[PDB]
Nucleic acid binder design. Structure first.
Length: 97
DNA sequence: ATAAGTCACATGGTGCCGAGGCCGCTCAATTGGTCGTAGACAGCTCTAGCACCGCTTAAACGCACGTACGCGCTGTCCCCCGCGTTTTAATATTAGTGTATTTGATTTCCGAAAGTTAAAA
């Protein structure tokens, strides 16, 4: 058995734990912190990737592309607050009317 | 006359009172010393650079020029406010209670560390 396996999360929480270790965020790394934040990250990735799926459906290209990613993330009004100053590579910009 | 004796004198010394003079304890962080490991290094090879030509014709710049366009124009509408006024609510005072913080003594908490081994392109 593995900690990354029993976590039931895609991203390996062991990697997150040791990243927190070398990241100097504190002297001890609470074992629930990496798994919790890994799950939060996985949900946010799920948001981006269900947007990817429906953008692939809308644009008829089965595999998601950065244009679709930029368009969907810029249409995500609440998420743009998190990613306001953020910008995406090769994504262009959403059309202004 | 002089051994005994009283006596006062003279110096002894013992006791108590400050007091200025050394001393005692503690914690800052230095520096002394010492392990063990980041750091610069030791041969090195090959990456993606960046020329270094050697083409082509796709951009592009000017050549022309044209509506679009701007930019003040100009009657006039309008609105902001400078006050003048009544309001009007902003002072800024006490207040004790009602948690809010809070700082002790633990007292569990738990993950870094030390094995031991699972897994891993």
């Amino acid at each position: 058995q593995s900690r990354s396996a029993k976590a039931g999360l895609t991203f390996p929480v062991g990697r997150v734990h040791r990243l927190l270790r070398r990241g100097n965020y504190a002297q001890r790394i609470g074992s629930g912190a990496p798994v919790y934040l890994t799950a939060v990250l996985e949900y946010l990735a799920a948001e981006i990737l269900e947007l990817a799926g429906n953008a692939a459906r809308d644009n008829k290209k089965t595999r998601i592309i950065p244009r679709h990613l930029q368009l969907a993330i810029r249409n995500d009004d609440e998420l743009n607050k998190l990613l306001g100053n953020v910008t995406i590579a090769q994504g262009g910009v959403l059309p202004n009317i």
